[PDB]
Design a protein around this ligand. Structure first.
Ligand SMILES: NC(=O)C1=CN([C@@H]2O[C@H](COP(=O)(O)OP(=O)(O)OC[C@H]3O[C@@H](n4cnc5c(N)ncnc54)[C@H](OP(=O)(O)O)[C@@H]3O)[C@@H](O)[C@H]2O)C=CC1
Ligand SMILES: c1ccc2c(c1)COC21CCNCC1
Ligand SMILES: c1ccc2c(c1)COC21CCNCC1
Lengths: 512, 529
């Protein structure tokens, strides 16, 4: 045969449980719910008007089976769909009641009777509330090329549920922005080569591939053919460490799997990389970032806002094993906050007015982005080697470095100690926000947030949790709204931060 | 052409022979000495030799059985008779292979299995038109290799380069560049105390639905190829002509290509002009080689004195100038210190740079003559005590970027930090470089921190594993383009080895003589202008 569908589906207007079905809304008043989508249009056009030279025998053009439902909706300029063999499932009207150089049908089976008689490459099913429906009910559809507009609109029609048992995903594209929404494209479904083998003559065998994880558990992960969604930069590092990672016991007498040296790149112009295979929260961490800009080392400011990210490191007992016997509870010492605004100054306590003592890097980096964008000395370093001893712990995040090309701002953050299961997910969120923040106050469009992992580890009792995680297919990323009016780094407040269209899988306890 | 039909291939291993130096592929030719191998065993050369000559793919047979007609599956090894008698007997005949011997002085009627016996080339064709075999490998020795190539009967060659020198009496014959081009070069390994690599030469011309989707998911790609920077990739014939570029130098070369083809056009401070990208990782296995670029000449005396200088804690430019190392000469002149607003700084007093920070971070810099005794943090001593006593720590860092001192320094550090990592008494090292001159600087910086990782690894009684290099601002200078183009069409030679003098057990106690770069084989020096 060679029959395929191809839909575009947004989310429907009326705690929320998201699932594949979330994305159903197909039409609103005989048109799309969204007024236009350039990138979706282009994808659909490239898909439906591509033909491979060879692959026939086993010009040459594709079929596009729409219905009266759909056909009529299309303007006259595009019609009859450029470079395609159009077809129209209408009971109502015959070839006598239409203009263009089309073919008609009436029954579902009268497509079989037309197709067995025709020259083509591939057969695409373009649209119809019911034109998808009865095609699934009559197991006729091989793959579904399915676009997810990751925003919410009013609709009157849907796309029918999809049987987990009948159809499964085998490809997830890169995530894009276009027409002020994110979207991605997925696929549902029912002599110099032996040279490769010779060059692999020295790798692991079959039971030497270090670690006692299982294939059987990663059924759905190992299945996916193209893993181009950028959440897979995180997921494949979980998969690299799990399978190839060195077993170490640490300081505490616990147990991790560790590798050394990874780099993730996230394009903030196209999405906000808030991992989608588990629920994440950003109030906790946006408030940590504001606390940093304000220059605080005061455990209490965060505790009183029920941000407990540092509670553990402020206790009488934790400071005392650092040898900080002269340190008030929740006085974390010269940490992120102090080093950013007062680097070099002598630290006294967390209450002291430090104004105009030390190096205000944050101001410096910002003036350098504005004054000298082509500089290669735009670093923000929290690892003061004089003050490490004095900190409740040394910075986990060593440095941000900045790059400006064509009014556009990228950011590498180098991390010395990466807990892949809990921390990294938040860490990717934090320095992403900061990059938007610095971009806005510097009149620049965010480009890539770039994350270098040093000691990258997965804790032994996060593993069953992460297996569950690897086997969940990423949803399209959300977007981050910064209040456009804010234009100094100190003038930001929690309410200037909005996450739009966060579609996500169920919460997971990395634990127990 | 006869050999395409019967898939007849050559496989060989060649060392460098007993006699500045010129180096071509004709450097590697040494085949055998006194009817044995010039090296004792290799082992990995053996394992590679075993895997290839015994590798069979039973699906891809039928296409080749069809092809041969028109003109437990096993390969055929073809062998001169003295190469046969070099084989140690407990290994005769070569297991899981059809052994063919080539002799005039011996026949069928005096072996004991051991083989098929033939007495002529066009006599092997007889057998291959008759036999059930996958591919046919010609394993030598010299007299065989020779008569097989001058007959245009070899379709490719699986040439191992044994990057050491041994006594030789039989050689592989000069390959002609016109008849054979290298399509593929492999990872470098260390085996029985030599670097070695694997290269393929090729005879020149002088569910399959997982296929469309790629094209689809590729819809929004920028390049149909209105080439994004004015580089004509038809100037990189050889670079693009290689199928498998697995040599670890291709990690440096590949970045030059990524920057050349994809860089952002920027101009700097002085106006000089660059193409830039942000953020690369290179990893090198120091256990398997020493990553000193082979696509041009590099001297290490300068960068080694510098590293010893840093460890001594010095900041005196004179000390290096008095050893004819001019690295920091430009950064210490009245002129340069003056534009830095360091008018109260003596010429060649460069200030609180690498040496100072490693030995005395957070001390107040006075001058290059102040001995700063027990003043500021001795980081280097700290990282050496952390690796010995605290290897599981994720806090074993050394940082040269002291925000407080940046303006007092002749220039800010390019090598922000090193972080060490210790699994199973092996020591990996990561270095973050804020700014990266790919054409001039990064080559030395690769060798510089690889050299340091070895030094730590020795004084902490550990073996060196990975040198990991993180690039941030990665830029090729517009003047380095032509030269880097030339360099990209040179095929890397196997990396040399670095031997430190093993009596050194203190980081303080290394001296220029305690450092030996053995078997540096390389293309000729390129001026980047
Ligand atoms: N580096 C590497 O990869 C390899 C190294 N070697 C080394 O090479 C050396 C052996 O090579 P070399 O000295 O050239 O000897 P060969 O292995 O090439 O054998 C030569 C002998 O093979 C027979 N022979 C060769 N060609 C023909 C022909 N066309 N027709 C009939 N008989 C033929 C003759 O045997 P007869 O005397 O009975 O007439 C001849 O004397 C050793 O030192 C060995 O270790 C060997 C192979 C691979
Ligand atoms: C009729 C049929 C199909 C379409 C339209 C009308 C409008 O845009 C699409 C093509 C692009 N994907 C979305 C749907
Ligand atoms: C006969 C034929 C070939 C060989 C030998 C004997 C000894 O080992 C080699 C194969 C591996 N490279 C070295 C040469």
């Amino acid at each position: 045969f060679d029959i395929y569908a191809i839909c575009a589906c947004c989310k429907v207007e009326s705690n929320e449980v998201f699932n594949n079905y979330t994305f159903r809304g197909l039409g609103n008043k005989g048109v799309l719910p969204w007024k236009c989508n350039s990138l979706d249009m282009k994808y659909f056009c490239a898909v439906t008007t591509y033909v491979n030279e060879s692959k026939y025998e086993k010009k040459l053009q594709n079929v596009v089976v729409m219905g009266r439902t759909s056909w009529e909706s299309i303007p006259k300029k595009f019609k009859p769909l450029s470079n395609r063999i159009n077809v129209i499932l209408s009971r109502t009207l015959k070839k006598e009641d239409f203009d263009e150089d089309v073919y008609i049908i009436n029954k579902v089976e009268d497509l079989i009777v037309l197709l067995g008689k025709l020259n083509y490459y591939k057969c695409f099913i373009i649209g119809g509330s019911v034109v998808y429906q009865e095609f699934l009910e009559k197991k006729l559809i091989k793959k579904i090329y399915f676009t997810r507009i990751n925003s919410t609109y009013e609709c009157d029609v849907f796309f029918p549920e999809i049987n987990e048992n009948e159809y499964q995903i085998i490809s997830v594209s890169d995530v894009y922005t276009s027409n002020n929404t994110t979207l991605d494209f997925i696929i549902y479904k029912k002599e110099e080569e032996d040279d490769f083998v010779y060059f692999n003559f020295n790798k692991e065998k079959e039971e030497k591939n270090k670690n006692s994880i299982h294939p059987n558990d990663f059924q759905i992960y190992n299945s996916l053919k193209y893993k181009y969604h950028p959440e897979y930069q995180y997921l494949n590092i979980i998969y690299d460490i799990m399978m190839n990672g060195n077993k170490q016991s640490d300081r505490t007498g616990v147990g991790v799997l560790s590798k050394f040296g990874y780099i993730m790149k996230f394009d903030l112009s196209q999405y906000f990389p808030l991992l989608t295979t588990k629920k994440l929260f950003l109030r906790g961490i946006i408030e940590e970032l504001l606390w940093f800009i304000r220059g605080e080392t005061n455990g209490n400011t965060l505790l009183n806002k029920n941000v407990r990210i540092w509670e553990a490191n402020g206790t009488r007992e934790f400071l005392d094993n650092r040898k900080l016997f002269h340190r008030e509870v929740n006085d974390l010492g010269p940490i992120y906050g102090f080093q950013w605004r007062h680097f070099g100054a002598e630290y006294t306590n967390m209450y002291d007015n430090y104004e105009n003592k030390g190096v205000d890097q944050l101001k410096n980096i910002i003036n350098l982005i504005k004054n000298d964008p082509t500089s290669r000395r735009i670093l923000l370093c929290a690892w003061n080697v004089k003050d490490l001893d004095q900190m409740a712990l040394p910075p986990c995040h060593i440095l941000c470095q900045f790059y400006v090309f064509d009014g556009k701002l990228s950011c590498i953050m180098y991390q010395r100690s990466c807990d892949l299961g809990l921390g990294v997910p938040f860490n990717i969120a934090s320095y992403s926000i900061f990059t938007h923040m610095i971009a806005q106050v510097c009149n620049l469009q965010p480009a890539q947030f770039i994350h270098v992992l040093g000691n990258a580890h997965v804790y032994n009792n996060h593993i069953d949790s992460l297996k569950i995680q690897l086997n969940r297919i990423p949803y399209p990323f959300p977007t981050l709204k910064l209040n456009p009016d804010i234009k100094n780094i100190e003038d930001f407040t929690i309410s200037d931060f909005t996450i739009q269209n966060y579609v996500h899988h169920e919460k997971i306890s990395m634990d127990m």
